């Protein structure tokens, strides 16, 4: 087949997928990217379609196959490559990218794709300065003038590293990265399994981190890490966070919580870490989310938020043992969203779980005693 991997077993094991793996990151399950839209694998846009259905029919028709929106890494190179392809013709059709193109070595190359797919061919044909200092050989001089520049500032760490490409002609730049995550996950991963971070490894990232391991804040950094599961850090969550969240250190993980936390003030970006929490917390061999679990959660999420949580503790703690379901979770947010300060528009026929009928029934003497 035309797209085997086997048939760049000639190259380098680095090459500019690996380069955009550690630059941009890569998904193997659709997502939907900034503008909402369906994506998968390095960036590849699959639909401007709303239907999750449409973006899966698109995935099997460039992948070969019935994926359900699930694929592995190689199919994602593949994918990746014919996106290389295209964004390589563009280049070879542009004045002003063309000669510089064709003058530089394969190393160099990369580096000048991976500045078309961040900013595109005219936001790189802009750099007409540095773009003739690299015709000219001059890297030094084309580092340090990249380094002048606002893409400098909307992305250090990966622009850093894509002008060292451009300094050096080697993939320096890449295999440091590799190793410095390689070295910091090591710190934390559990002696007796190395693909995960175990319960002592979180203590001692929270330690490093001056985080509280209780506070909030731990569980807003697991949300942006897309952890699966309470008391474990997979391999790939810690790569794959470090990764979206440009950080190969813990200094500049540090730098990033109070961003992390600022993104909550949004009410979308909220629920989305609030419904997060469900499936975090849960236990992954259960169906539904224990009791005393929820409340934990609920106490340390919606403190401050849900003006009856006061209320809402003193009436689950006489309720019997029972598993609360997602969707009993997600609404809770819309009824605190909603809710009069007296309850006085809650609507019975609105479908709402039992378990909020009842509460807003037992909650009656407490409001009546206050009005008193
Ligand atoms: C802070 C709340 N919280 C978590 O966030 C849990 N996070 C995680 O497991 C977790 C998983 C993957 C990656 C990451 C990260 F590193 F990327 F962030 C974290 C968990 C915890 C365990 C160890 C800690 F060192 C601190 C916190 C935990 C436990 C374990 N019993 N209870 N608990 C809790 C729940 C409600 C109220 C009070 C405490 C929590």
């Given at each position: 087949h035309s797209q085997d991997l086997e048939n760049l077993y000639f190259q380098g094991s680095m090459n500019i997928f690996e380069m955009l793996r550690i630059d941009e990151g890569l998904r193997l399950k659709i997502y939907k990217d900034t503008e909402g839209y369906y994506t998968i694998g390095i960036g590849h846009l699959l639909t401007k379609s709303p239907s999750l259905n449409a973006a899966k029919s698109e995935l099997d028709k460039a992948i070969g196959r019935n994926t359900n929106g699930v694929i592995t890494k190689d199919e994602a190179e593949k994918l990746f490559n014919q996106d290389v392809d295209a964004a390589v013709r563009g280049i070879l059709r542009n004045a002003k990218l063309k000669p510089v193109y064709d003058s530089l070595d394969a190393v160099r190359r990369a580096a000048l794709i991976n500045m078309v797919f961040q900013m595109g061919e005219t936001g790189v044909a802009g750099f007409t300065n540095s773009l003739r200092m690299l015709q000219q050989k001059r890297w030094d001089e084309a580092a340090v003038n990249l380094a002048k520049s606002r893409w400098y500032n909307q992305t250090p760490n990966r622009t850093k590293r894509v002008i060292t490409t451009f300094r050096t002609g080697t993939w320096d730049a890449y295999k440091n990265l590799r190793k410095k995550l390689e070295q910091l996950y090591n710190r934390y991963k559990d002696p007796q399994d190395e693909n995960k971070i175990g319960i002592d490894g979180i203590q001692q990232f929270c330690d490093d981190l001056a985080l509280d391991p209780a506070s909030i804040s731990v569980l807003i950094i697991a949300w942006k890490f897309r952890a699966a599961?309470?008391?474990?850090?997979?391999?790939?969550?810690?790569?794959?966070?470090?990764?979206?969240?440009?950080?190969?250190?813990?200094?500049?993980?540090?730098?990033?919580?109070?961003?992390?936390?600022?993104?909550?003030?949004?009410?979308?970006?909220?629920?989305?870490?609030?419904?997060?929490?469900?499936?975090?917390?849960?236990?992954?061999?259960?169906?539904?989310?224990?009791?005393?679990?929820?409340?934990?959660?609920?106490?340390?999420?919606?403190?401050?938020?849900?003006?009856?949580?006061?209320?809402?503790?003193?009436?689950?703690?006489?309720?019997?043992?029972?598993?609360?379901?997602?969707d009993t979770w997600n609404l809770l947010l819309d009824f605190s969203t909603m809710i009069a300060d007296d309850m006085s528009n809650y609507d019975e026929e609105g479908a709402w779980p039992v378990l909020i009928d009842d509460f807003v029934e037992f909650a009656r003497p407490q409001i009546a005693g206050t009005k008193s």
């Open positions: 599961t309470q008391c474990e850090f997979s391999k790939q969550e810690f790569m794959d966070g470090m990764t979206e969240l440009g950080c190969d250190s813990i200094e500049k993980l540090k730098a990033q919580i109070p961003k992390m936390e600022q993104e909550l003030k949004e009410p979308g970006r909220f629920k989305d870490f609030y419904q997060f929490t469900f499936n975090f917390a849960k236990n992954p061999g259960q169906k539904g989310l224990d009791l005393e679990m929820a409340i934990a959660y609920w106490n340390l999420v919606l403190n401050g938020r849900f003006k009856f949580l006061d209320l809402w503790n003193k009436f689950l703690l006489e309720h019997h043992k029972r598993s609360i379901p997602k």
